[PDB]
Specification:
Elements: E1 7-11, E2 22-25, H1 36-43, E3 58-63, E4 66-71, H2 81-102, E5 106-110, H3 124-135, E6 141-146, H4 149-162
Parallel strand pairs: 1-6, 2-4, 5-6
Antiparallel strand pairs: 3-4
Helix pairs in contact: 2-3
The structure holds 3,5-dimethyl-1H-pyrazole-4-carboxylic acid ethyl ester and chloride ion (CL) (3 copies).
Organism: Chikungunya virus (strain S27-African prototype)
Subcellular location: Host cytoplasmic vesicle membrane
Protein name: Non-structural protein 3
Length: 163
C-alpha cells in the first residue's frame, strides 16, 4: 500500500500517467474505441488480447508487466438512469477488487461514463462519488485524469472537501 493513501487529480492524457497501473474506460467488446480507450489502445495495444468483458465489470490484461484494468461503464444512451447508476457503481467496485488483487501502490483512473457514454449529461459528481465509494477502502494512491480545466477545479474541490 501507499504510506499515506491519497487522492489527486491531473489534467493530461492518462496514457502518460506516472502510476503503477491504469484503468481503461473500455467498451464491452475490447475494441480500440475512441477518447480514453483509443489513447490506451495506442499506448498498450497488447493489453487488448481477450479484454472483452460485460458492462459493470473490470478485466485486467498485462502489457509486459504493466497492468491495464479494462473497466466497462454503462452507456446512458442505452440504460435507464436507475440501471445505469447501478452498473456504474458496480464497474468501480470491480476496479477496487483488481487494484487490491494486483498489490499496486498507485493507480491512474478516468471518470467512467462521463464522455461518449454520458447520454449527453454532466455526470462528474455521479461518477466521482461512485469512484470514492469503491476506492475509499483501498490503500493505493489514486490519481484521477481529466482533460477539461473546469472539471479539474471541480474534482480538486471535491477531493479537498473530505480532507
Ligand atoms: C475528453 C476525452 O478524452 C479524455 O478524457 C482522455 C484522457 C483522460 N486521456 N486521453 C484522452 C483522449
Ligand atoms: Cl497531455
Ligand atoms: Cl465514456
Ligand atoms: Cl474531462
Amino acid at each position: 500500500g501507499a504510506m499515506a493513501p491519497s487522492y489527486r487529480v491531473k489534467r493530461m492524457d492518462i496514457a502518460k500517467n506516472d502510476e503503477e497501473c491504469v484503468v481503461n474506460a473500455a467498451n464491452p467488446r475490447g475494441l480500440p474505441g475512441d477518447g480514453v480507450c483509443k489513447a490506451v489502445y495506442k499506448k498498450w495495444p497488447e493489453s487488448f488480447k481477450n479484454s472483452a468483458t460485460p458492462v459493470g465489470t473490470a478485466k485486467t490484461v498485462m502489457c509486459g508487466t504493466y497492468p491495464v484494468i479494462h473497466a466497462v461503464g454503462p452507456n446512458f444512451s442505452n440504460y435507464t438512469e436507475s440501471e445505469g447508476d447501478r452498473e456504474l457503481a458496480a464497474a468501480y467496485r470491480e476496479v477496487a477488487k483488481e487494484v487490491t488483487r494486483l498489490g499496486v501502490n498507485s493507480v491512474a483512473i478516468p471518470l467512467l461514463s462521463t464522455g461518449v457514454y454520458s447520454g449527453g449529461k454532466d455526470r462528474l459528481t455521479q461518477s466521482l462519488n461512485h469512484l470514492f465509494t469503491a476506492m475509499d477502502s483501498t490503500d493505493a494512491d489514486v490519481v484521477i485524469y481529466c482533460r477539461d480545466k473546469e472539471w479539474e477545479k471541480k474534482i480538486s474541490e471535491a477531493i479537498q472537501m473530505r480532507t
